[PDB]
Design a protein around this ligand. Structure first.
Ligand SMILES: NC(=O)C1=CN([C@@H]2O[C@H](COP(=O)(O)OP(=O)(O)OC[C@H]3O[C@@H](n4cnc5c(N)ncnc54)[C@H](OP(=O)(O)O)[C@@H]3O)[C@@H](O)[C@H]2O)C=CC1
Ligand SMILES: NC(=O)C1=CN([C@@H]2O[C@H](COP(=O)(O)OP(=O)(O)OC[C@H]3O[C@@H](n4cnc5c(N)ncnc54)[C@H](OP(=O)(O)O)[C@@H]3O)[C@@H](O)[C@H]2O)C=CC1
Lengths: 252, 269
């Protein structure tokens, strides 16, 4: 696993911050790690800010993933830093979940969860397509040109992971639709030499994973150490797949 | 043959006192209405929802209605919670305390954009029509579905007792990705995979209530959505809906939350 440039959304806390830390700590670290976040001037951005003060490597980019203009500015801004060099790796990680029961689910929540979890990875892939294409041109591997969508087995229609812990229909629907988007990107972008894959990170001890004790749970470090290992072993025939942080096949 | 799938070919008993079909003025939805009316034991009420009920769109439905006193035409814009609300309240009043046995979420849209020109607006609109509206309609009809379940008490589940039918698509199958070469239509595919998800969740959360749920693929149907293309694989509305109704007539509680086609075959998610 050797990537010269990577962009991670939702990079200030939880799994996305884990990705940043691990990526900077790779045997051969990237030339550019772009870590996006909503409020680079907020307390929740500080851990990232300090990381950037120690690593000239790390570029904090402001990004509201549901706002097409914010997405546009973030893409101009990273494109100017890459000075026409490619983007090897896009990790769509930013996401939300809302704790609504099937009976309480609303149009608002169904819609907002979908636009953050599903539409935004599409928009961001479209906006960075030019840079991913460049990188492919400089089979299909994550070291070359890849889109990584962080999904969930909560969005597995077969498995319905963790049903007895939460219904979160807006979230499950959005994650199934993200597994479909991943398949579509895989087929649509294959001709550009761009790999796509969906990953389940596990039930991670983050703000989203919640407070519950369970020994199937994993730490941020175990989850992202896993996912990065998985990426480093992926080849063409896995493009469009849905794999977990241990590299296992998850049912759709 | 050489395949045989009796789940789809055998004419089981479908005994539904009341049904509501969304998107009932043309295409598959109109087929559902005509076939439901033509059942050996016809429903006491067939609610057919449409838009612009006295406009050109709804002409053939209005014709049908003049000839069938059991056909009730209901105005409904599925993307508008207020219109959903008013439709449920109206149907509830016509039912006079009786349950709704069968809710068919059929209304839907597809758009022709490719991956490069997919938009926020198109993704969001197709989702609200194809995925959120079946959810909201299910919530609004839940009291009446539950009343139908209570009318036929017990462990069993069937489409004659209390059922939600979501008309989905193997274009929404992540594994099969049907008709990819014909059209990418990401907004449509993502919404149908999410509808398969919704159906699954509904089967789980509504089972305790006695309500059956299932997603059906109607085939590639000769309608305005399916298009004009001459193809051996294509079915007519009569074939697709005659098939789907045989499928429903055969389902039991072991099948709740399945994804099936009009032939009764099990479809991959
Ligand atoms: N933790 C778990 O157990 C599991 C998580 N996942 C998936 O992992 C991914 C990361 O999850 P996790 O780290 O746990 O989640 P957290 O809630 O801990 O982190 C959410 C991250 O996403 C960002 N985000 C949310 N909405 C937006 C937005 N509109 N624009 C820009 N950023 C946004 C948040 O920013 P801010 O700090 O500004 O709020 C934050 O950086 C998510 O996609 C999640 O669905 C999947 C399975 C399990
Ligand atoms: N035909 C095919 O090959 C396939 C179809 N399907 C599914 O079958 C279902 C019916 O498809 P089909 O008959 O072919 O489609 P049509 O385009 O022929 O008919 C669409 C129907 O849905 C109604 N509708 C659309 N949007 C709304 C809305 N916002 N509010 C209320 N009604 C709305 C339309 O009403 P109006 O007349 O007012 O526009 C019309 O009654 C769809 O869910 C479709 O996805 C799945 C696989 C294949």
């Amino acid at each position: 696993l050797r990537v010269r440039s990577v962009l991670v959304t939702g990079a200030n806390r939880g799994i996305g911050l884990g990705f940043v830390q691990h990526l900077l700590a790779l045997s051969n670290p990237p030339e550019w790690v772009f870590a996006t976040c909503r409020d680079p001037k907020g307390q929740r951005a500080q851990e990232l800010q300090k990381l950037a003060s120690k690593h000239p490597n790390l570029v904090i980019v402001p990004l509201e993933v549901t706002d097409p203009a914010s997405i546009k500015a973030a893409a101009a801004s990273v494109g100017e830093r890459l000075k026409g060099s490619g983007l090897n790796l896009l990790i769509n990680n930013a996401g939300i979940a809302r704790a609504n029961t099937i009976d309480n689910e609303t149009l608002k929540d169904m819609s907002e969860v979908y636009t953050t979890n599903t539409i935004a990875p599409l928009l961001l892939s479209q906006a960075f397509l030019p840079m991913l294409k460049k990188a492919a041109q400089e089979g299909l591997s994550c070291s070359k040109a890849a889109i990584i969508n962080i999904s969930s087995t909560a969005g597995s229609i077969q498995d319905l992971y963790l049903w007895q812990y939460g219904q979160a229909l807006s979230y499950r629907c959005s994650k199934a639709a993200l597994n479909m988007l991943t398949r579509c990107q895989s087929m649509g972008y294959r001709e550009h030499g761009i790999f796509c894959v969906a990953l389940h990170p596990g039930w991670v001890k983050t703000d989203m994973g919640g407070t519950l004790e369970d020994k199937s749970r994993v730490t941020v470090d175990e989850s992202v150490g896993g996912m990065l290992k998985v990426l480093s072993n992926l080849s063409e025939k896995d493009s469009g797949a849905f794999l977990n942080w241990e590299g296992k096949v998850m049912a759709w």
